[PDB]
């Protein structure tokens, strides 16, 4: 029996392929703020993929850029969950 050498990897990207990733100079990056908040609130209750899904919704709905530069003003962001995991992951047991 063998398993792929690329199996059991999970990449939690802050943004979709090809996109900028936003950061607030005072509150931190949108993604990390949201990730920590969701882990603090759901790590002892939800499976990791479901936690990350809440992170996606939080980032997608609660954040929007503000800039004097029209090019970077009113932009949005959606994180990107990339899973090669082979089992469900709970931080508790």
């Amino acid at each position: 029996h063998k398993i792929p050498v690329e199996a059991d990897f999970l990449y939690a990207y802050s943004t979709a392929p090809g996109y900028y990733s936003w950061r607030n100079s005072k509150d931190g990056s949108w993604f990390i703020q949201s990730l920590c908040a969701m882990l603090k609130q759901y790590a002892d209750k939800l499976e990791f993929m479901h936690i990350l899904t809440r992170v996606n919704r939080k980032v997608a709905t609660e954040f929007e850029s503000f800039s004097f530069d029209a090019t970077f003003h009113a932009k949005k962001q959606i994180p990107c969950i990339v899973s090669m995991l082979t089992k469900e992951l709970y931080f508790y047991h």
Binding site: I3, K75, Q77
Partner: protein, 146 residues
């Protein structure tokens, strides 16, 4: 014993595992990359969050491309037998498939390869999590009203 399903990773090893946080805020002038203000806020939030999840957190700041590779190589060579998983958080400038050291880029594939199932046997079959806060390009999402 009774029916055994194995649908979830075994997370009751003696240790949850390591949580390596690479926080790059200041970059070498010659790179022309701006400082990432607020990243320390992220680094501290992560250290505390994963501390509460019982991970052995190690924070590293402003690492060159060489130090990032050396760090990952050294960590992948540790004995993770008694650890349930591995977590690595990367906070820096970046492009698609790339994370920036303070003096240049590092291919994400090079970093993750050290932990391949065949290269880090004490982590084979265990979850390896990479959390990446960095650009993956220059596209901007204009969004749509709901």
């Amino acid at each position: 014993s009774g029916i055994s399903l194995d649908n979830s990773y075994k997370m009751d090893y003696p240790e949850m595992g390591l949580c390596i946080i690479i926080n790059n805020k200041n970059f070498h002038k010659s790179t022309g990359m701006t400082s990432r203000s607020g990243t320390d806020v992220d680094a501290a939030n992560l250290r505390e969050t994963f501390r509460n999840l019982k991970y052995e957190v190690r924070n590293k700041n402003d690492l060159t491309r060489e130090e990032i590779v050396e760090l990952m190589r050294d960590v992948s060579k540790e004995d993770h037998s008694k650890r349930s998983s591995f977590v690595c958080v990367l906070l820096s400038h970046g492009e698609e498939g790339i994370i920036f050291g303070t003096n240049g880029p590092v291919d994400l594939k090079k970093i993750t390869n050290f932990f391949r199932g065949d290269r880090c046997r004490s982590l084979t079959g265990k979850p390896k999590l990479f959390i990446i806060q960095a650009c993956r390009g220059t596209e901007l999402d204009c969004g749509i009203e709901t």
